[PDB]
Write an enzyme that holds these catalytic residues in place. Structure first.
Site, PDB file in Angstrom:
ATOM      1  N   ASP A  50      81.889  30.087  48.677  1.00  0.00           N
ATOM      2  CA  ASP A  50      80.841  30.401  49.661  1.00  0.00           C
ATOM      3  C   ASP A  50      80.636  29.174  50.573  1.00  0.00           C
ATOM      4  O   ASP A  50      81.629  28.619  51.032  1.00  0.00           O
ATOM      5  CB  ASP A  50      79.636  30.873  48.845  1.00  0.00           C
ATOM      6  CG  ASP A  50      78.466  31.433  49.659  1.00  0.00           C
ATOM      7  OD1 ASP A  50      77.559  30.645  50.061  1.00  0.00           O
ATOM      8  OD2 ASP A  50      78.389  32.665  49.806  1.00  0.00           O
ATOM      9  N   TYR A 104      72.940  27.444  58.148  1.00  0.00           N
ATOM     10  CA  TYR A 104      73.152  28.717  58.822  1.00  0.00           C
ATOM     11  C   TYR A 104      73.128  28.529  60.373  1.00  0.00           C
ATOM     12  O   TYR A 104      73.929  29.149  61.069  1.00  0.00           O
ATOM     13  CB  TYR A 104      72.238  29.809  58.294  1.00  0.00           C
ATOM     14  CG  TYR A 104      72.726  30.403  56.954  1.00  0.00           C
ATOM     15  CD1 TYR A 104      73.703  31.383  56.933  1.00  0.00           C
ATOM     16  CD2 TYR A 104      72.265  29.904  55.752  1.00  0.00           C
ATOM     17  CE1 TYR A 104      74.182  31.883  55.727  1.00  0.00           C
ATOM     18  CE2 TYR A 104      72.695  30.400  54.544  1.00  0.00           C
ATOM     19  CZ  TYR A 104      73.659  31.374  54.522  1.00  0.00           C
ATOM     20  OH  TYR A 104      74.113  31.832  53.327  1.00  0.00           O
ATOM     21  N   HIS A 156      80.855  39.106  44.798  1.00  0.00           N
ATOM     22  CA  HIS A 156      80.920  37.858  45.566  1.00  0.00           C
ATOM     23  C   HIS A 156      80.759  36.598  44.710  1.00  0.00           C
ATOM     24  O   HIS A 156      81.270  35.563  45.075  1.00  0.00           O
ATOM     25  CB  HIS A 156      79.827  37.815  46.676  1.00  0.00           C
ATOM     26  CG  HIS A 156      79.922  36.634  47.596  1.00  0.00           C
ATOM     27  ND1 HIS A 156      80.864  36.555  48.604  1.00  0.00           N
ATOM     28  CD2 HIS A 156      79.143  35.528  47.721  1.00  0.00           C
ATOM     29  CE1 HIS A 156      80.683  35.435  49.283  1.00  0.00           C
ATOM     30  NE2 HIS A 156      79.657  34.787  48.760  1.00  0.00           N
TER      31      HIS A 156
END
Lengths: 295, 295
Positions: free
Chosen positions: B102, B209, B269
């Site tokens: 990730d 982000y 995930h």
């Protein structure tokens, strides 16, 4: 100066809802439908001028402002379009014009597609059909319009996030939408604020955004599949900003309707409050040119 | 059973940060980089087996877990890649393998692109470069990955929303990411929880982000413009699910690197915690086959 001088505030009882409406005037009927995160007061700079020549009906959309579902309720555009048929019916109108902004323009076009005998004319402020919006999604649209994707998350994720400090999220949103311009009358602002502080209203807004992803988009697809178009004159008034290929509002509406006109307005997304005189000039010209439709 | 038996917990002081690392083992060095919204404990089912044959370094990414910037700080992938060079340097390693999941795989590939002499081998769990993710954005991606667009909103919008009831948002996210599976060890869970309750950590996550939208994507574009590729063997382990045309992880990596292998893993995930034995089988096989690279 007074907001909505001489408008009569009503509550109407339909099969599925308790709806706040405000009414004034005489002559052909016009229904005006506000958007998110507002109420019928968003029309305070436009509606009085219109009531000089028309019957004017302002409503709060089911779940927004002071309008509420009786229940698990349906907040889909089809359902809120049914509310409008029933509201205008009760007030004495079987056929009428519809002027919508933002979510209310979405209720508007659904109504005109589902009930073409009831809609004499249709004005969209800042809106194209959701089917077209979804096809245009890319990185910058999802950033600009992040809340479309947050508010559609499963119950109760977004209700928890927006419900933490409601007034702060409300004000931020309003400022962002207005591009920082001082367009919100201080008394209309407290009305938008008290609705957003109501958890029922915040839930109804999320349900609207969920319906936009799902059932609303399905409905629009089924119409395009059937080649079903709006049957009345259409006007679209859009925010002056660049539009990508295939995304121009006039070009998009022409794929949904045989009779379309429109104009760019040099203001923000919040056209009713930011550019009321520009809007009124175009509305009045459109309604005058189509007075035969209104008959 | 114990989390990370025999790992030595360190704090390292770099020019721009105070970093939590945990270390164990002997032999060629491997750096393992966790993702969002976790910490280095996400590797608890993998790292001990690896330490039987390798030098194993686990870090918390700057801003996450117990790692923190000294300041207005830079949370871009380039900056966190610099942290990794400095961390491994201090521990005595100038060249090492990198296994990321990730967000940590995003730090990983940036590091391998900027400092190819330092990266001996690179494993991505569930990640392709952000340039490819942005090109693939459409309605369903923005719904599935809504937080990518919420967390990138200007300061301090998302910090206010997620900061309201932090632990609730954390747990929800974790459950969603795991597709409802009971994969979170109750003690590792409290570690993920206490980081997310720290406003500094939530701010650092938002900054990550934001950087993904901006500077990170610019960096990836400049590499593709220059035709710059990772110079080491690459393995990608991906979640078994459908991939659209051009979006298959193996095909995407092959556009970023001359030497690429990979495999689908039948889990969620959260591969490190949900499918540790499957992952380990592929990791061990890859590191063994490329032992010359590690020299």
């Amino acid at each position: 100066d007074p907001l909505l001088p001489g408008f009569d505030y009503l509550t109407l009882h339909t099969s599925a809802a308790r709806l706040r409406v405000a009414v004034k005037g005489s002559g052909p009927p016009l229904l005006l439908l506000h958007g998110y995160p507002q109420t019928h007061l968003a029309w305070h700079r436009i509606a009085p001028r219109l009531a000089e020549d028309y019957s004017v009906v302002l409503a709060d959309l089911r779940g927004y402002g002071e309008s509420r579902a009786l229940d698990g309720a349906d907040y889909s555009k089809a359902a809120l379009a049914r509310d409008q048929l029933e509201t205008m019916g009760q007030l004495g109108f079987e056929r009428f014009a519809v002027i919508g902004h933002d979510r209310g323009a979405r209720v508007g076009y659904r109504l005109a597609l589902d009930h073409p005998q009831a809609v004499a004319a249709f004005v969209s402020l800042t809106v194209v059909p959701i089917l077209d919006n979804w096809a245009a999604v890319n990185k910058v649209f999802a950033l600009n319009a992040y809340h479309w994707f947050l508010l559609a998350q499963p119950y109760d994720l977004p209700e928890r996030l927006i419900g933490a400090d409601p007034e702060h999220f409300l004000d931020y949103t309003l400022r962002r939408m207005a591009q920082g311009r001082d367009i919100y009358h201080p008394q209309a602002l407290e009305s938008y604020r008290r609705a957003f502080r109501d958890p029922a209203v915040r839930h109804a807004m999320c349900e609207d955004y969920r319906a936009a992803v799902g059932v609303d988009a399905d409905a629009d697809q089924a119409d395009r599949d059937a080649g079903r178009r709006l049957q009345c004159p259409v006007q679209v008034l859009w925010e002056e900003r660049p539009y990508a290929a295939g995304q121009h509002p006039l070009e998009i509406w022409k794929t949904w309707a045989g009779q379309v006109e429109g104009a760019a307005i040099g203001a923000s997304h919040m056209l009713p409050e930011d550019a009321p005189d520009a809007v009124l000039e175009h509305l009045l010209g459109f309604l005058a040119s189509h007075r035969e439709a209104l008959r």
